[PDB]
């Protein structure tokens, strides 16, 4: 298991524009197009992202290309962020993937807001971080995914994904 396989499980793959759990236009492997209520605004973000006139449909190669870019971007946002970078550097390889997963889902700003959990993660207080992570809109809105990510931080193994 790795970050790509982990996010593919959590995000799924859809080749036509769809609404995510929050109701936002999305495509591929959780690639958010726009928070705007307009399907035309989504189609236009999609064409610009892909570089061709898509009419709301992309191929598997194209979905995987956006995915690679988004994972790369999530990693780069962690490393550029003063709050996230030291947590990431402190973590083993498996828990690093859990942090990337969170950033991919909710953005670097959203994750940097988990100040108390991040401190507990840095201190390697795994059971306590797991309890604090669960006290969140994140956990209450997407509990099955959040539980898999929290388990990964708690145990440092891929058991929630096998
Ligand atoms: Cl893009
Ligand atoms: Cl979920």
From Swiss-Prot:
Keyword hit for Magnesium: no
Catalytic activity: Hydrolysis of (1->4)-beta-linkages between N-acetylmuramic acid and N-acetyl-D-glucosamine residues in a peptidoglycan and between N-acetyl-D-glucosamine residues in chitodextrins
Positions annotated to bind substrate: 32, 104, 117, 132
Hydrolase found in the keyword field: yes
Entries under Gene3D superfamilies matching the protein: 1.10.530.40
Consequence when changing residue 30 to A: Almost complete loss of enzymatic activity
Active site (catalytic residues): 11 (proton donor/acceptor), 20 (proton donor/acceptor)
GO MF annotations in UniProt: lysozyme activity
Main location: host cell
GO CC terms in record: host cell cytoplasm
Field pH dependence: Optimum pH is 7.3.
Annotated localization: Host cytoplasm
InterPro entries, A to Z: Endolysin_T4_type (IPR034690), Glyco_hydro_24 (IPR002196), Lysozyme-like_dom_sf (IPR023346), Lysozyme_dom_sf (IPR023347), Phage_lysozyme-like (IPR052619), T4-type_lysozyme (IPR001165)
UniProt-reported outcome of changing residue 132 to M/F: 2-fold decrease in enzymatic activity
CDD domains tied to this protein: T4-like_lys
Superkingdom, natural source: Viruses
EC number: 3.2.1.17
Similarity comment text for this entry: Belongs to the glycosyl hydrolase 24 family.
Annotated function: Endolysin with lysozyme activity that degrades host peptidoglycans and participates with the holin and spanin proteins in the sequential events which lead to the programmed host cell lysis releasing the mature viral particles. Once the holin has permeabilized the host cell membrane, the endolysin can reach the periplasm and break down the peptidoglycan layer.
This protein's name: Endolysin
Organism: Enterobacteria phage T4
Annotated gene: E
